[PDB]
Amino acid sequence: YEPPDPRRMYTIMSSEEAANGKKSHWAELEISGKVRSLSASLWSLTHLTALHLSDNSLSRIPSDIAKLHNLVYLDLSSNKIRSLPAELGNMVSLRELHLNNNLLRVLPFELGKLFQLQTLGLKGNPLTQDILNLYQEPDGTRRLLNYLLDNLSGTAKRITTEQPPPRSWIMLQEPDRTRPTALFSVMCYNVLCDKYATRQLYGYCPSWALNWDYRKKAIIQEILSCNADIVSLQEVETEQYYSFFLVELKERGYNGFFSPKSRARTMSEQERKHVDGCAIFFKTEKFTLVQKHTVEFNQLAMANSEGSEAMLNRVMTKDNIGVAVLLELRKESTEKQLILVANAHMHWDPEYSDVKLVQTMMFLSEVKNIIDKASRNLKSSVGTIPLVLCADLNSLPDSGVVEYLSTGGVETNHKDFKELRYNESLTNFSCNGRITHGFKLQSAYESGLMPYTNYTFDFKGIIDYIFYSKPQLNTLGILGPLDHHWLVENNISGCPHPLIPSDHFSLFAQLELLLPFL
Amino acid sequence: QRICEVWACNLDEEMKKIRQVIRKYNYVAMDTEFPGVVARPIGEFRSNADYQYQLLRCNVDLLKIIQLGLTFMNEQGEYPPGTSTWQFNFKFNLTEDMYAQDSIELLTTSGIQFKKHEEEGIETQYFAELLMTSGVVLCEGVKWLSFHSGYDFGYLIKILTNSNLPEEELDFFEILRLFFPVIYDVKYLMKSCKNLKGGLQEVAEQLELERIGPQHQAGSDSLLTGMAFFKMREMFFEDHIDDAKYCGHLYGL
Ligand SMILES: [Mg+2]
Ligand SMILES: [Mg+2]
């Protein structure tokens, strides 16, 4: 049972081994060289059954250490470790651990779950006075694990003692009946992909509430509750779209279109599995897709000039960060009126406003060209096509990124352009001293009916939006915010939260389109 | 100025050149400097040489190559016009990645620009593709030279396959035969010759070969490996090597 004290290899005797020829099974490994960190390919050795990481300069321990489900021994003596992970409690098979001469303040409560741990070493660590008192008692090893397991009951994960009140609905207008009209509901939701949903960012959020298997079920219960005739999503891992979101949503009657944010990487499958992107769904009973697009800049539509080239370098990013689809209203819910529905996500942070601002002009400028390409052949006569735009611009409502959309244009000197103020190349994107575009859009949640669409610990603001062409479209109602008083009763510092799957809130809003003639 | 430093910025350009130089200069010497050894298994082994592979397995899979050097020459033993050797400097991050402390100390004294490697290092994944298209590897009539090349070719397989090394010591050889039909380990040849022992620099003194570039660097060592092979072939082997006997043998394996 004891591992051999000599850390030396052993060879089978030649005469007996060679004749029998049994294979070489090595189950023990050592790591030395006062290494600073560890590698990921180490956690792939599931066959290992005893690991010697003693006498190193290991700062921390990854959670993927638990990937050695067969491990029955572990040594971390004389290392520079500050604390242990929580996933260590899932290594039941472990039967002996050593933590001597480290910088351990308090052991994780999950450690008591290791009911097979017969021996434990702790000499040389700064542990609470009481922990050192239990370890001295006879059979203090068993006694201490029971204590750490007694404290794990204090955490009481998934109590869920609170209850979520429903979100209220607000009415902005009645549906006028002067002319025939079409009414369809829209949703916008940034589901917070798993790749960027770490605890380092959302530290107020327990690990079981961050688990994608836990959120993905609560997310979908939200998209189905709203039953929007159009659903627009952001931060959706490609794997999860095809194998989860598009699966569960077809059962309810949707047909979606996805597109990843990056295509030129061409990484391995595993890398490509967790790439996120923007998806658009729609009820078939009301819509019928006529086209699909993944927005990109042709890069030649502008007048070939060194300045535009010199500029675009500072701005362009390999990610397309944009998706759009063209739909068709079915006769029953001659003219054949269509609707373009766009979806976008700006990852960049507020400090890079010049990128987000030019990227936005870039995005919309490409939209206008896509509409014209379809408004020629498919439009019955000449020939306007509406635009239902929903995006997560990661921009507040006063920002320039948002000024460009609401006011129909932005000044060439806007604070957000920063170094790019007055660059001649910017004037090209408009259709002077100001950049304008043909669209005349209007926000669906104007007047700040939702105080904030992203509620984190350090940031509260409005970054998700739903726009529309005012001459064509109107909004009859929007889904108001969560009872703010509830957020206080429960001391919710930020999101995600046991009861709140994403870090954003959903934007369900009802629209109205004008039908002429028959 | 035979040696040439290769970084990610000036990589794809050089590969275009090597594509054309390899036709007339098919013999290639190779050496790599890596973040030392860190891991050693314990357990029953079929043979001492069997362990040696298992040892080489763990560390190749676990660590990233730091620098590579390749000297292209013809069967006569002549360097091509222009730069003779290319020193490939890989993207090794001093913080995130793993390495033995003493191993980094030696590479600092050798002159590796660690910080410049992180910022302007070569992405191994992409480099593999270019080396694949060039055709140096996996081409009938291309022969490979190397000294203490267990780890050397170890890392090269992981790069080109982008996978951990096979478990079976047999599975590792069968793959090595394809990418490199003909290999000659310089040390395995020294076993046959008399009065030849020790490290590489010790061999250079016996054979009176001047040292060009920074000693104990991947690029410089690669150049010294190739020249030390031609004069060794002309001297102890009479300008000829028996393939079947010495082709495909790596010292310690
Ligand atoms: Mg986000
Ligand atoms: Mg070397």
Numbering used by the authors:
A (entry chain A): 6 to 338, 350 to 398, 403 to 451, 459 to 545
B (entry chain B): 10 to 262
From the paper:
The CCR4 and CAF1 deadenylases physically interact to form the CCR4-CAF1 complex and function as the catalytic core of the larger CCR4-NOT complex. CCR4 belongs to the heterogeneous EEP (exonuclease-endonuclease-phosphatase) family of phosphoesterases, whereas CAF1 belongs to the DEDDh family of nucleases, which also comprises PARN and PAN2 (34,35). Consequently, CAF1 serves as a bridge between the NOT proteins and CCR4.
Human CCR4 only contains a short N-terminal extension (M1–K28), which is followed by four and a half LRR repeats (LRR1 to LRR5) and two C-terminal α-helices that shield the hydrophobic residues of the last, incomplete repeat unit (LRR5). In the interface, the hydrophobic surface of the first LRR repeat gets covered by hydrophobic residues from CAF1 α-helix α2 (C67 and L71) and by M107, as observed for the corresponding residues A215, F219 and I256 in S. cerevisiae. Importantly, the loop L(β2–α2) rearranges upon complex formation with the CCR4 LRR domain and folds into an additional turn of α-helix α2 and into the two β-strands βL1 and βL2, which pair with distinct β-strands from the CCR4 LRR domain. Difference electron density was observed in the active sites of both CCR4 and CAF1 and was interpreted by placing Mg2+ ions. However, due to the limited resolution of our crystal structure, we roughly positioned only a single Mg2+ ion to interpret the elongated difference electron density in CAF1.
